[PDB]
Design a protein around this nucleic acid. Structure first.
Lengths: 206, 114, 79, 150
RNA sequence: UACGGCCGCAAGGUUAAAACUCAAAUGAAUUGACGGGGGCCCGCACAAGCGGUGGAGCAUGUGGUUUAAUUCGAUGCAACGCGAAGAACCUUACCUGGUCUUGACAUCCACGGAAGUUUUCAGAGAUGAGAAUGUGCCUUCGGGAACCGUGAGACAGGUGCUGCAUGGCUGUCGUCAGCUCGUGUUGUGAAAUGUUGGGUUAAGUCCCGCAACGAGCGCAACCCUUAUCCUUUGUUGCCAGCGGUCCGGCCGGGAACUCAAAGGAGACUGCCAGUGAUAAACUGGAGGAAGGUGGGGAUGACGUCAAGUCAUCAUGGCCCUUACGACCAGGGCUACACACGUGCUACAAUGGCGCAUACAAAGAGAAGCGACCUCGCGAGAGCAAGCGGACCUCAUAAAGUGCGUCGUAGUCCGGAUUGGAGUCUGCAACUCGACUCCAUGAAGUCGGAAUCGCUAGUAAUCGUGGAUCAGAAUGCCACGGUG
RNA sequence: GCCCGGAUAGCUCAGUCGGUAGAGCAGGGGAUUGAAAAUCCCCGUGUCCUUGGUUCGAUUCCGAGUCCGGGCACCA
């Protein structure tokens, strides 16, 4: 290890918090807790929903929760299916009137999360890492953007000797706070080991 | 410099020179260094502020010097004021423990009065 | 303060305290094993300790839970 | 290493206001208890009255005169072995150095107290006495006394 | 080389095999590593100084040695106040003994039984053998759900072994300036060039050059924080003016000022001069509160050490399963007959001691921080307000300065040790705790060989707070004073 | 068998007019080293071969013994 989180390092500027709200030592303890339960669950029943981030606003006993996804319709439900379920599931989980507003992801090829959850899913589909890692991710360069650094952990392909891979385009100056980058992880528990992946998309400068 | 005030034991092993204090003994001055880390083979000089002075910390637990003696002289009198045999003998410089005051008791009684 | 898992106590006194409470209370029970520990149930009971010459009274207190019985019984003479 | 700036401008004495006496109190100072240093030297510095009886001011400099060297050694890792090539000493350290010998040797004097154990040394300085004055020749016996390498 | 021949005075020469043995031996050239090779550089590396460690007593860890156990790990710089920001039980993983074998922890099934509370005895306890108290609801009166019992088994369980099976995470060269790619060109090729050279910078920073032209990871800059001023708001913060004083910004009042804290201006070699090829840059200078990445953080390239961690967690394989699973009690991790590293306090008048007294910062706090007041010599206890916080509390800094003293002795130094008796935590502090009082008052009179840190608010020293935490801090993290 | 000598630290040795004995090495504890050495610092638990005697007192002095070592055992 020898790298600072390209996201948290910027959590101050050019990067909003995926959970903005106030709280005091009292409830704060169980507060961030519920947020985890709800957030962890919203993925379980919406994995293939192609969900990106998941913000969580909190005014007063009424969390908002915004499920950003490239596939909104599927996260919507049969004109009330999905929404109702989730919006209701947030019952005792937070013991408060929790809403839920979906956000459409523009260009699902420039968002880290997706580009990460995807490549990993392809790997689980018995596919050559190099191919997808390169091409199936190279797209982020065709819909725009200036630079995208990918990274696949070890154990790739039949081999006991874990190895990391490079492959990067444009420029990803993660040494610039005013740079703003879309970083996110993604695992892939396969027949053996847990081939990981890290997406570094440089979406413009300042 | 004097820890419990006055008397600066210098140029001697710790514990050994620690007993210098009119209150600790071969064992006590020893039992303190343990929880102080300070070894015995180290001369007070060899020490430092965070070595010699530290000793002055766990020393305020026991009673020493002047008042220790006074507190005793008085305590003694407390039981000695009472018309008990001990006191009656304590105010005459006679053995109150159990010796033969009938003879051999120089250091006890005092000098010879022929 | 040296058993980690398994606060041991000399069985000798064990069977007694448990017997005393059985019939309520009574006079102290002779004991030579100090190395044990002031058991909780022994709370407010009577125990003795052969400190070499004779025994010594022992009246357990709330606090007396995992402390060594011997602790309450001196040994050598002094002053 | 290669750094090259200037000297640290020191604050003058708490009275006479003199850098020469300034770094003097500092060299004498201990445990940052600068206060004591002043109250320990500033006294003995004036206690000279009882030791003389006049405007005790130049006495200090005059006393240091007998403790001002002008030659020191300096081993050099050359010629396979280690040279010694002795060289003089610029003024910047002349006055300074001396002050050390005057104090670093006035402590082992073993007199009444540092306050006075120091005073006497000054009188012994100009009158040649103590290791303070000794160190001079005991040092000169190398430089100027072994120019064979100088 | 042997044997045979020939030559020789003799050294020995000349001619010249085999057995057996290996899968290579070898030549030049390339990349790099290294050199007790050379050139040029930077870093508290050295030199210059300031203070240390090495001796001493005590703390802490480690190797030993021991132990029933002294649980496992960490071992050149990268191991040792390290995983432990906190070992009396617990923790715990270790030892001893008692005890439990679908099991303490998960589900499935069978049949039962509310869960629950008070409970008696046998026991160290783990537990077992009994007395009650207990009946909530889905009621389609089969069945049920949470939970409990016990029977069977698939299993559950492993801080067990491999960190040379791994993920994740970390230290290190090193904040070092380095590491590469595309294309083009060069050699038969490994490979080179670029990226070398000349200046220059903290820097593969920049400027020229140049068979290379460009590009990426880096360095720089974005982030925080500290250094000036401005806009804005004015409680618990502030008091310049005016006023009223139960003299305290206490009370009107006042948004000025300190401060708070959201947003702004400012520093760029921008401007002046000289050097440099009239370039990069350097050297000074002006203006400013602040210069030449302002000070400090944060940020750690490509990879190396099969470096560390299966013991936080996860996990391939291997193991154990009426037991390297699991419960209780006590004991152990604090043992010693030595050593090595990191610390605290000294060895003293740049000081102690009495009295007096002035100055700061950043912080914690509902099983909490705890006032005032009362008791006690004191630790602390009783009673009980305030604050869940610029309102209150822990907290009413130390150095320091005034006076006085003691006068260089082992002391008026320094406190180790021990005894006497006490407090507070907690079932409980023998083992093995923190602290108070009284008495005891040692070694130590500045420490060889050798060695460490430190370039400015630095080293040096002086206090203040916090994490862990019921209660064992001289350790760690952090703050400010003097300097 | 005879005469002369030795027996002292684990090894090889030095030493004493009679009272408490050492060196080189090995050994051990520190150090320095990445680790070994080499080097640096600090460390002797010797019933002075046995057994008799002199003596207040024996490694030392006297007698003897074992062991080792040197020499000798010849005419026949």
């Amino acid at each position: 290890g020898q790298k600072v989180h390209p996201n948290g390092i910027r959590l101050g500027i050019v990067k909003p918090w995926n959970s903005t709200w106030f709280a005091n030592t009292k409830e704060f303890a169980d507060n961030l807790d519920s947020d985890f339960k709800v957030r962890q669950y919203l993925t379980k029943e919406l994995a293939k929903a192609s969900v990106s981030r998941i913000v969580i606003e909190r005014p007063a006993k009424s969390i908002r929760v915004t499920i950003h996804t490239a596939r909104p319709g599927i996260v919507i439900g049969k004109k009330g299916e999905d929404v109702e379920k989730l919006r209701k599931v947030v019952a005792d989980i937070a013991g408060v009137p929790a809403q839920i507003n979906i956000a459409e992801v523009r260009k699902p090829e420039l968002d880290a999360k997706l580009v990460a959850d995807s490549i990993t899913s392809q790997l689980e589909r018995r596919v050559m890492f190099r191919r997808a890692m390169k091409r199936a991710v190279q797209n982020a360069m065709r819909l725009g953007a200036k630079g995208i650094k990918v990274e696949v952990s070890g154990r790739l392909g039949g081999a006991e000797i874990a190895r990391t891979e490079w492959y990067r385009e444009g420029r990803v100056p993660l040494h610039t706070l005013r740079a703003d980058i879309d970083y996110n992880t993604s695992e892939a528990h396969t027949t053996y080991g847990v081939i990981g992946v890290k997406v570094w998309i440089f979406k413009g400068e300042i | 410099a004097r820890i419990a005030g006055i008397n600066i034991p210098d140029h001697k092993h710790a514990v050994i020179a620690l007993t210098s204090i009119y209150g600790v003994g071969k064992t006590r001055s020893k039992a303190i260094l343990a929880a102080a880390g300070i070894a015995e083979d180290v001369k007070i000089s060899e020490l430092s502020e965070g070595q010699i002075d530290t000793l002055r910390d766990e020393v305020a637990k026991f009673v020493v010097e002047g008042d220790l003696r006074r507190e005793i002289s008085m305590s003694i009198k407390r039981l000695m004021d009472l018309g008990c045999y001990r006191g009656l003998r304590h105010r005459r410089g006679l053995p109150v423990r159990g010796q033969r005051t009938k003879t051999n008791a120089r250091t006890r009684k005092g000098p010879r009065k022929p | 303060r040296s058993l980690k898992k398994g606060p041991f106590i000399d069985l000798h006194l064990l069977k007694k305290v448990e017997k005393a409470v059985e019939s309520g209370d009574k006079k102290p029970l002779r004991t030579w094993s100090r190395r044990s520990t002031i058991f909780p149930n022994m709370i407010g009971l009577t125990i003795a300790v052969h400190n070499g010459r004779q025994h010594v009274p022992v009246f357990v207190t709330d606090e007396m839970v995992g402390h060594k019985l011997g602790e309450f019984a001196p040994t050598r003479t002094y002053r | 290493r290669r750094r090259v700036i200037g000297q640290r401008k020191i604050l003058p004495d708490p009275k006479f206001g003199s850098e020469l006496l300034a770094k003097f109190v500092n060299i004498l100072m201990v445990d940052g208890k600068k206060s004591t240093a002043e109250s320990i030297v500033y006294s003995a510095l004036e206690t000279l009255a009882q030791r003389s009886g006049k405007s005790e001011l130049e006495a200090f400099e005059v006393a240091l005169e007998n403790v001002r060297p002008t030659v020191e050694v300096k081993s050099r890792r050359v010629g396979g072995s280690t040279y010694q090539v002795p060289v003089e000493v610029r003024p910047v350290r002349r006055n300074a150095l001396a002050m050390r010998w005057i104090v670093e040797a006035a402590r082992k004097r073993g007199d009444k107290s540092m306050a006075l154990r120091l005073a006497n040394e000054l009188s012994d300085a100009a009158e040649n006495k103590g290791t303070a004055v000794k160190k001079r020749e005991d040092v000169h016996r190398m430089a100027e006394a072994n120019k064979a390498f100088a």
